[PDB]
Amino acid sequence: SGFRKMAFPSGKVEGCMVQVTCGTTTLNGLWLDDVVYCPRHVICTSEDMLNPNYEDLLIRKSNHNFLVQAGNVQLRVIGHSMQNCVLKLKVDTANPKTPKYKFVRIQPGQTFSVLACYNGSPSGVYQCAMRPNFTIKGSFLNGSCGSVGFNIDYDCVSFCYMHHMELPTGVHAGTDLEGNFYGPFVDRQTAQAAGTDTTITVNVLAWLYAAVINGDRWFLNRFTTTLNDFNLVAMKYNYEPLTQDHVDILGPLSAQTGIAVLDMCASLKELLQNGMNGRTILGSALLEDEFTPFDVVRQCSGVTFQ
Amino acid sequence: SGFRKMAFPSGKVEGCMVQVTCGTTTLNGLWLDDVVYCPRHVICTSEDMLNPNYEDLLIRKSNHNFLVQAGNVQLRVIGHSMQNCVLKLKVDTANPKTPKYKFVRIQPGQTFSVLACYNGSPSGVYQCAMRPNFTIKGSFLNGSCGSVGFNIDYDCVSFCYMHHMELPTGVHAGTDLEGNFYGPFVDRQTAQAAGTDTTITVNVLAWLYAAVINGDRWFLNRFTTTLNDFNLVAMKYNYEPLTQDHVDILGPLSAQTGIAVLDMCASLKELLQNGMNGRTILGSALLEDEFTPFDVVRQCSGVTFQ
Numbered sequence: 001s002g003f004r005k006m007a008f009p010s011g012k013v014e015g016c017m018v019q020v021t022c023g024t025t026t027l028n029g030l031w032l033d034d035v036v037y038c039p040r041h042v043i044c045t046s047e048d049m050l051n052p053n054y055e056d057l058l059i060r061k062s063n064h065n066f067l068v069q070a071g072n073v074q075l076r077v078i079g080h081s082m083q084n085c086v087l088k089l090k091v092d093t094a095n096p097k098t099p100k101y102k103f104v105r106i107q108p109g110q111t112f113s114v115l116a117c118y119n120g121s122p123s124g125v126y127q128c129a130m131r132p133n134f135t136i137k138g139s140f141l142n143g144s145c146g147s148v149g150f151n152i153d154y155d156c157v158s159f160c161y162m163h164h165m166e167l168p169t170g171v172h173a174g175t176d177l178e179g180n181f182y183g184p185f186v187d188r189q190t191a192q193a194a195g196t197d198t199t200i201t202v203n204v205l206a207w208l209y210a211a212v213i214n215g216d217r218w219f220l221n222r223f224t225t226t227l228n229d230f231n232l233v234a235m236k237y238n239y240e241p242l243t244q245d246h247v248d249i250l251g252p253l254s255a256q257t258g259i260a261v262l263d264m265c266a267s268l269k270e271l272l273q274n275g276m277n278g279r280t281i282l283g284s285a286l287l288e289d290e291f292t293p294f295d296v297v298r299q300c301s302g303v304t305f306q
Numbered sequence: 307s308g309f310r311k312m313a314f315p316s317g318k319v320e321g322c323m324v325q326v327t328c329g330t331t332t333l334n335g336l337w338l339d340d341v342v343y344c345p346r347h348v349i350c351t352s353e354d355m356l357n358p359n360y361e362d363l364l365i366r367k368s369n370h371n372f373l374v375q376a377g378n379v380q381l382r383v384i385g386h387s388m389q390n391c392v393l394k395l396k397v398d399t400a401n402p403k404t405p406k407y408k409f410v411r412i413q414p415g416q417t418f419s420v421l422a423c424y425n426g427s428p429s430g431v432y433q434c435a436m437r438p439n440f441t442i443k444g445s446f447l448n449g450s451c452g453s454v455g456f457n458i459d460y461d462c463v464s465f466c467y468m469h470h471m472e473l474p475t476g477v478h479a480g481t482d483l484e485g486n487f488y489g490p491f492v493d494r495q496t497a498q499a500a501g502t503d504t505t506i507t508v509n510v511l512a513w514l515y516a517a518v519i520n521g522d523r524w525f526l527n528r529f530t531t532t533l534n535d536f537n538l539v540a541m542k543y544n545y546e547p548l549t550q551d552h553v554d555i556l557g558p559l560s561a562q563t564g565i566a567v568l569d570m571c572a573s574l575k576e577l578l579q580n581g582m583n584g585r586t587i588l589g590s591a592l593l594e595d596e597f598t599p600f601d602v603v604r605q606c607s608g609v610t611f612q
Contacts, residue, residue, distance in 0.1 A: 001476070002476065121612045139605065143610050304449050
């Protein structure tokens with residue numbers, strides 16, 4: 001019956017994108033209630049991006065030096081201000097297509113959908129993970145700053161990401177929706193380091209369960225092993241250690257399939273020490289870590305949706 | 307700046323899904339104007355699916371034996387009828403969220419987005435290819451029949467697929483929107499054959515161009531070769547032959563990157579005869595054929611969207 005990397009429907013979010021402009025720079029903004037969210041470097045030129053003094057740069061604009069635009073319609077300004085690395089504009093219309101929504105600060109290894117936008121218009125949507133080094137491997141061209149990430153919650157859009165930076169190494173960086181960067185980075189054109197990205201072990205395991213459920217099941221073997229024994233090897237291959245909170249949330253798949261977490265680890269242990277590069281699981285010739293246990297459970301069951 | 311498998315925004319389509327029911331069976335339907343589209347086997351039980359006489363089964367229902375439902379709201383019936391393997395219900399409301407749209411019959415190797423739905427509600431969206439054997443490798447659980455595929459066109463939704471069948475081999479089958487199956491299949495629970503799925507050669511090539519543009523560029527080499535020379539090998543590895551229409555549409559990428567189609571073929575020729583299984587391109591440890599040349603051109607350029 002199959003297993004696809006899929007994203008959440010993006011309807012609820014498309015009606016919230018707008019374009020923000022501040023005499024020259026245009027990027028994307030998130031229009032909820034009577035408030036537009038957007039990255040604060042929209043008040044910078046390209047020169048200014050070497051070292052922005054955001055204090056001094058913002059103190060010069062004003063509630064008209066900012067060009068918000070939702071559909072036909074310009075909107076009008078009423079209040080501006082900076083919440084960490086986001087600006088929060090005030091404007092003269094509560095947004096009717098505003099949905100039930102939260103903001104939250106997700107953690108490394110959780111997944112979400114990105115709605116890539118250009119000049120306030122949607123381009124596409126894809127499902128990505130937040131790397132353990134708090135970057136994402138996204139797909140963004142210039143102008144896409146302000147595109148948002150959203151996981152879901154359940155009928156209630158949980159905004160988790162705003163895109164700000166492409167690093168000079170190729171990877172992508174951004175904030176949560178009240179402006180707090182994920183990871184060390186700053187909004188400043190500099191060669192800054194992420195360093196070591198690890199493979200998300202709990203996600204690889206959930207994906208192995210998804211494989212068994214469909215029946216790419218060749219990779220299994222009856223070795224057993226301990227946490228301790230498995231976590232030793234995982235550190236050799238830069239896989240995240242797997243603690244007891246991970247074993248627990250895999251329990252549901254443990255039960256539906258008949259396979260203890262620690263037995264699945266053993267077959268993965270061995271996929272790692274060799275890489276039986278004969279074959280394929282769910283097609284992929286590499287081990288997948290962008291599905292969480294919750295994702296597999298939805299793509300299997302809990303989403304024959306209402 | 308990166309390269310993701312991404313789907314089109316699904317906003318325009320979500321507002322067109324409804325649930326169709328005919329005393330028991332519920333599947334998904336496409337509600338445009340004052341017409342609902344849905345698979346015709348919604349008038350079958352599970353027993354009946356062995357050998358349905360659609361003639362005789364339809365002649366028994368009627369414009370009330372059918373339970374359409376869009377949001378709150380039931381709708382009312384007015385006319386029913388069967389267009390090949392789809393039913394086209396009449397009902398008492400033109401659908402306001404109906405968008406500009408066409409139907410067309412796409413060809414093997416073209417790509418589109420699927421909006422997987424359950425009981426008329428959206429579950430997710432993903433970007434898949436139509437295999438040369440006119441199947442798709444989708445992700446569908448029971449109830450998802452009537453989920454639609456749509457490529458786009460340009461601001462105008464082009465509906466290209468309706469899901470009908472999971473084959474007893476795992477792959478998926480369906481029709482265009484005026485009811486014509488893609489491939490040989492019939493809407494009838496039987497062990498029926500697709501046979502040989504080939505790799506879509508023009509798509510692999512466009513993906514190799516996408517790789518160079520980002521700069522996973524190791525796989526290139528200065529062998530040259532002829533069409534003839536390349537197509538000989540491709541048939542050894544069940545890759546589709548590549549004719550002159552394919553060389554042409556690759557021309558745009560040929561130009562932006564500095565690499566003739568036939569030179570790129572040569573590096574692929576050799577990826578094929580060995581599989582330099584050392585490495586990775588765009589991450590993938592296998593050759594990708596679910597991006598078309600148009601997709602790469604959009605994911606690179608023509609979609610800094612308006």
